[PDB]
Design a protein around this ligand. Structure first.
Ligand code: SF4
Length: 224
C-alpha cells in the first residue's frame, strides 16, 4: 500500500476511535511519557495505570525521583515484575538531575544514552511529548507493519529489523506524528493481535497483504 494512504487511514481511524484519555496524555511531558513507556514495556495497560498514578503523586518531577532512596522506588514497583526496569529508571533520573539540571533531555542522542532507554523508547518519548519526527518500533508496531507489507523472517536478525525500521520511517508522517504513533500502538494492542486479528475492524484491511491472503500467521517470522 502507498505510504501516504497508510498514514491518512490510520489518522482518520484514530480521530473516531482512538485512546485519548490515558493519564500520560493529560498535560503530557517528556517525564510522563518516559515513565509510561518503561512501565508498559512488559506490563499491560490495565495493571500499569494505578502504578503510574502513585509514582506521579510521590515523585512529581524527575529530581524528586533521583533524590529518593532506591529502596523506596523498588517498594513502589512491587507487583510490576522485571525489576531491572526499576533499577535503570532510578539511575536514569540521577543522570538527568546530574548532567541536565533536572530537565528531561530533548535531543535524541541524549535521551537514548539513558540506561533502560533504547532506540524505539527514545523516539516514542520525543515524538509523543514534543512532536519530533521520529518513528517507533515496539512489538505491537512490528506486527502491524510486517503483516501489512508481508515482511517474513525473524526480527532478531539485523537485516530484518532494519527493513522494519525503514518501513516505519516511510509510513510515519510529520503532520500528526503524535496521533499516528499512539494509533499504531493501539492497533497492535487491540486489533492486529497475535492470535486471530480482527481485520474487519482494521483501517488497513483494504491494502494489507496478509489480509488479502489470510496469511497473518506468517508475519513477523518466528525464531528459527
Ligand atoms: S488487516 Fe488484519 S493483519 Fe492487516 S494490519 Fe489490520 S489487523 Fe493486522
Amino acid at each position: 500500500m502507498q505510504a501516504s494512504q497508510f498514514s491518512a487511514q490510520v489518522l482518520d481511524w484514530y480521530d473516531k476511535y482512538g485512546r485519548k484519555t490515558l493519564p500520560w496524555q493529560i498535560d503530557k511531558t517528556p517525564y510522563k511519557v518516559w515513565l509510561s513507556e518503561v512501565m508498559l514495556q512488559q506490563t499491560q495497560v490495565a495493571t500499569v495505570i494505578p502504578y503510574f498514578e502513585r509514582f506521579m503523586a510521590r515523585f512529581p518531577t524527575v529530581t524528586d525521583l533521583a533524590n529518593a532512596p532506591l529502596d523506596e522506588v523498588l517498594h513502589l514497583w512491587t507487583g510490576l515484575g522485571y525489576y531491572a526496569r526499576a533499577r535503570n529508571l532510578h539511575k536514569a533520573a540521577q543522570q538527568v538531575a546530574t548532567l541536565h539540571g533536572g530537565k528531561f533531555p530533548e535531543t535524541f542522542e541524549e535521551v537514548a544514552a539513558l540506561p533502560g532507554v533504547g532506540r524505539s523508547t527514545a523516539g516514542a518519548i520525543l515524538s509523543l511529548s514534543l512532536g519530533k519526527h521520529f518513528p517507533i518500533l515496539d512489538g505491537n508496531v512490528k506486527r502491524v507493519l510486517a503483516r501489512c507489507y508481508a515482511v517474513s523472517g525473524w526480527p532478531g536478525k539485523k537485516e530484518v529489523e532494519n527493513k522494519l525500521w525503514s518501513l516505519s520511517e516511510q509510513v510515519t508522517p510529520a503532520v500528526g506524528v503524535e496521533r499516528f504513533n499512539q494509533a499504531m500502538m493501539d492497533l497492535g494492542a487491540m486489533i492486529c493481535t497475535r492470535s486471530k486479528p480482527k481485520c474487519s475492524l482494521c483501517p488497513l484491511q483494504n491494502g494489507c497483504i496478509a489480509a488479502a491472503n489470510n496469511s497473518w500467521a506468517l508475519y513477523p517470522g518466528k525464531k528459527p
